[PDB]
C-alpha cells in the first residue's frame with residue numbers, strides 16, 4: 811500500500827472526515843473501525859479525538875487498500891494518517907473505536923488494529939471501561 815496526499819476540509823465524526831483528494835471533496839470512512847455515533851456513549855469523545863488529530867496535522871495522507879475504494883454511500887474507504895500516525899489505529903488504541911467491518915481484500919491492517927484493540931482492552935480504556 812501507499813500513502814497519497816489529501817487536505818482537511820472538515821472534521822465530521824469519530825470515523826468519517828471530509829478531505830480533498832486529487833482536488834475533489836470527498837467524505838472518507840476509516841477502514842476496519844467503528845466509532846460510536848455522536849449520540850451514543852463515547853461518540854462525542856471519538857469525534858473530538860479524530861477532530862484534534864486531523865486539525866492539528868501538518869500533513870494528512872490517505873492510503874487505500876487492495877479492494878473497494880468507495881462504499882455504497884460514495885464514501886472513500888481508506889486508512890488516514892496525520893503526520894504519519896494512523897488515525898484508524900490511534901482510535902482503536904485509545905478504546906474509542908472497535909475493530910469492525912473487516913471485509914476480505916480490504917483488510918491489510920487488520921492484525922495491527924487487533925493488536926491495538928487488545929492493548930486498549932487490557933488497559934480498560936473508554937469503550938472497554
Ligand SMILES: Cc1cn([C@H]2C[C@H](OP(=O)(O)O)[C@@H](COP(=O)(O)O)O2)c(=O)[nH]c1=O
Pocket residue numbers: 839840841842843844881882887911913
Ligand atoms: C467501514 C465500511 C463500511 N461499509 C458500510 C457497511 C455499513 O452498511 P449499513 O449502512 O447498511 O449498515 C456502513 C457502516 O458505516 P457507518 O458505521 O459509518 O454507519 O457502511 C462498507 O461497505 N465498507 C466499509 O469498509
Ligand SMILES: [Ca+2]
Pocket residue numbers: 825844845846847
Ligand atoms: Ca460509526
